[PDB]
């Protein structure tokens with residue numbers, strides 16, 4: 396037969412704003428600005444997951460980590 400990791404079998408992806416804070420709930424056009432904002436809440440890693448609730452220094456660290464958590468936009472009738 397046939398097989399192999401494929402995933403990404405989604406039709407519509409609706410992920411939160413590209414640059415938005417979870418602490419307060421604000422959004423920004425630039426990531427650089429948002430990064431400086433999060434500070435007003437805490438001065439730690441510029442990245443932090445929500446599902447698990449962990450902080451990361453590098454980007455890739457989170458980019459790949461996200462995997463652990465299912466990624467699929469919400470569907471509706």
Ligand SMILES: [Zn+2]
Nearest residue numbers: 416418419420
């Ligand atoms: Zn905030």
Ligand SMILES: [Zn+2]
Nearest residue numbers: 444446447448
């Ligand atoms: Zn996580």
